[model samples]
Target chain A: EATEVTLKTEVEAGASGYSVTGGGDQGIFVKQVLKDSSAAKLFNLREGDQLLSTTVFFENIKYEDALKILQYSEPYKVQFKIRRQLP
Target chain B: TEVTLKTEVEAGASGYSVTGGGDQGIFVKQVLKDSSAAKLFNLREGDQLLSTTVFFENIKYEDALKILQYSEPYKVQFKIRRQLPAPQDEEWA
Candidate 1:
């Protein structure tokens, strides 16, 4: 199963606390989702969840580049497709 | 040569323009600076768009524009064909 997370308001730095691993064709996965953070609410995301795609225009982008986009780019309304393992 | 450019178009403009269609296919006319098509993908003028999720073989020019426009705000993979420059070196068979 998978999901899409969309952000309507300005992204809050450090508020949407989450960590990820794997990138550059290998794909990006959620390593951790901070408890009580925006990620906990918005993420529906669990550890090991993979980000299949995004409206940011990057394809199998490197971790640092993905991080930069999340941190700096002001995407008016971005949607992230996350793939999750069946529970 | 074949190229696949996966990109995201911002809310407003589509970021790129096209020309030629039907038999010629859809060729990229221009890529706006700072736009997703320019910054995210290595698209260039003269590259024919083979598909934009929807295949564009023998498609009309206006139709190509519509397909691109309607697919906006979502990430799309555009298959393009780039004609390679001829080699200067030649040998008689």
Candidate 2:
């Protein structure tokens, strides 16, 4: 069995959109719904959502960098701006 | 290309201490004496800290778990509180 420790962070809700071409090709795209938290909640975001920004408990670094930072702190913040589609 | 960054905190002899326990535990784990922070002599270990901004206030451990799902960057501020040594008179007298 594997045990894990949890921490604190920040997150933002949003929607996602995409389009396809007729030339037997697919185009994946993303969009941000600024200031519209309700839309974010309505669509149970999946993995395709694009992460816009974050504010974790560590210094100003990249996403991978923040994970290393969390190893030190307990309660951290992580903010995200995502986009999803309506099925 | 794959690039990774590691972040941590240290204490000096004469500065606010950054340590404490919360829903999970303290923010910092250990402090090295040969690092730049130790060379400056500003802080030490066992110092308690708190959040001064709205961002860090009232944080939870579960929240952190979710954020890790999708790698992201973050920034935070800490309020440092030091632990003073006990008086010598009681030990020797």
Candidate 3:
């Protein structure tokens, strides 16, 4: 059975160097995490992590919403809820 | 593929997450602990999850999760490929 788990994180600096994409086949998930990025350093987010919508973004249209939400360019507080598998 | 995986499901909700994003492309695996698998499992940096194959069907970053969203019995077969980190820093175009 699929165990549902929720993920939460915040980017104090706001601007993010990561990118996400969705709707072609897998729906929406991490696409790229820039080297030495806040996201990469935190190590809390990675490729293959499925974005399952959020307080600011809805599902049907996820990745784009993610880009919109994660692009701090100023500094922000956002919580994420993405799904993954167990090993 | 950095690592090849094999498994059988009992026809139900798969305790796994599938995605195609970031430098690493699309991939599939189970969550190892209290939360998100990517933030805490294998398929780390120094590599990229390039792509995936399902029944010979090519799946891109888009729609990679489509099969997973279904709620039915499945005898699905998938293959994931990954590339090691670049010798030097390279930006995506």
Candidate 4:
């Protein structure tokens, strides 16, 4: 028997950015840059980076769902293969 | 998306003078007074508070978070800073 069940959540890529409008000025605003992370290194991402992509998510998945999938007790690393066209 | 309105009593200058060592101070904290935030104004649990009039932007995140968790009324102030600098310096020169 379990006394209480807690729901765990992890940060996803989409949650890292905000959406903006206009054709020439359309992009996602990068909120924060994780220190010494792959996203910090490979992308040279900053607090504000406008990203353009054919599809936002690498796979058709919501951020909450991705977090749910990654929730576990043991430590692990998951690779995200994303395609982007920079502005 | 629904909307909610949260209300708080603004504190006065000299920091809403109270009594006792732990009593008299401009403490901030977040409390769930009403359930329907959307109906009231959609105040979320983790909404980042930028600034309050009692203190300037100098307040740290932890201190601000701690203060908001209390029940007392605060003298809340919103100070908006312009994203871009004014061109007055160039004109003056």
Q: What share of the true interface contacts does each candidate keep?
A: 0.02, 0.06, 0.03, 0.00
Error of 2 at B70 (Å): 7.1
TM-score of chain A of 3: 0.44
Model 1 lDDT per residue over A1-87, tens place = 113342232222222455655543354455787888655664344666554432323232333433333332222223222221232
Q: What is candidate 1's CA lDDT for residue A16?
A: 40
User: If you score just chain A, what TM-score does every candidate get?
Assistant: 0.45, 0.19, 0.44, 0.31
- Cα lDDT of candidate 4 equals 0.26
Docking class of 3: incorrect
Query: Candidate 3 lDDT, tens digit per residue, A19-56?
Result: 66654444455678788876566534567555443222
The numbered model that scores best in TM-score is 1
Off by over 4 Å in 3: A1-5, A24-26, A56-87, B1-93
Q: What is the lDDT for B30 in model 3? A: 42
Q: Write the per-residue lDDT of candidate 2 for residues A5-49, one digit (tens) a residue.
A: 123222322222221111112211123433433323443222223
Candidate 4 ranges beyond 4 A from true positions: A1-26, A54-87, B1-92
Lowest-sum lDDT 10-residue window in model 3 chain A: A72-81
- What is candidate 4's TM-score for chain A? 0.31
User: Scoring each candidate complex against the real one, what DockQ results?
Assistant: 0.02, 0.04, 0.05, 0.02
- What are the TM-scores, per candidate, against the unseen true structure? 0.29, 0.24, 0.27, 0.19
> For model 1, which pairs clash?
none
For model 1, the superposed segments whose C-alpha errors exceed 4 Å read: A1-15, A56-87, B1-93
Query: What are the lDDT scores of the predictions, listed in order?
Result: 0.41, 0.29, 0.34, 0.26
Cα error, candidate 3, residue A67 (Å): 15
Q: What is candidate 4's lDDT per residue for A1-87, written digit by digit as tens?
A: 223222212222322222212222232334565776534554344454332211112133333322222221002111212122233
> In candidate 2, which residue ranges exceed 4 Å CA deviation?
A1-31, A38-67, A70-87, B1-24, B40-43, B49-93
Ranking by lDDT: 1, 3, 2, 4
